[PDB]
Amino acid sequence: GHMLRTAGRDGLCRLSTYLEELEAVELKKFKLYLGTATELGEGKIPWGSMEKAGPLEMAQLLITHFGPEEAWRLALSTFERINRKDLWERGQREDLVRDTVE
């Protein structure tokens, strides 16, 4: 687990690792949320070309359309939206909890 990446750079690697935790319907929510999103403007995802896509295909989908860490953002920030707040907290913690600490 640890000391695996002495020198490394993830992006897609972290994206996949979290998207592999999502089941078909979880990915379903995820890919419709951002893929058919009008809040995202037009939607960087092609027209239904993610229906037969799984964690592997999805990771390589977001990474190609959005970008390495943009894909990651699109996943973590959608985890919270599909009621996958658990894994979402595994993604973003950012900084500070209440006072002084964290």
Swiss-Prot record:
<feature type="domain" description="Pyrin">
    <location>
        <begin position="3"/>
        <end position="97"/>
    </location>
</feature>
<protein>
    <recommendedName>
        <fullName>NACHT, LRR and PYD domains-containing protein 12</fullName>
    </recommendedName>
</protein>
<comment type="subunit">
    <text>Interacts (via pyrin domain) with ASC. Interacts (via pyrin domain) with FAF1 (via UBA domain). Interacts with MAP3K14; this interaction promotes proteasomal degradation of MAP3K14. Interacts with NOD2; this interaction promotes degradation of NOD2 through the ubiquitin-proteasome pathway. Interacts with HSPA1A and HSPA8. Interacts with HSP90AA1. Interacts with TRIM25; this interaction inhibits RIGI-mediated signaling pathway.</text>
</comment>
<comment type="similarity">
    <text>Belongs to the NLRP family.</text>
</comment>
<comment type="function">
    <text>Plays an essential role as an potent mitigator of inflammation. Primarily expressed in dendritic cells and macrophages, inhibits both canonical and non-canonical NF-kappa-B and ERK activation pathways. Functions as a negative regulator of NOD2 by targeting it to degradation via the proteasome pathway. In turn, promotes bacterial tolerance. Also inhibits the RIGI-mediated immune signaling against RNA viruses by reducing the E3 ubiquitin ligase TRIM25-mediated 'Lys-63'-linked RIGI activation but enhancing the E3 ubiquitin ligase RNF125-mediated 'Lys-48'-linked RIGI degradation.</text>
</comment>
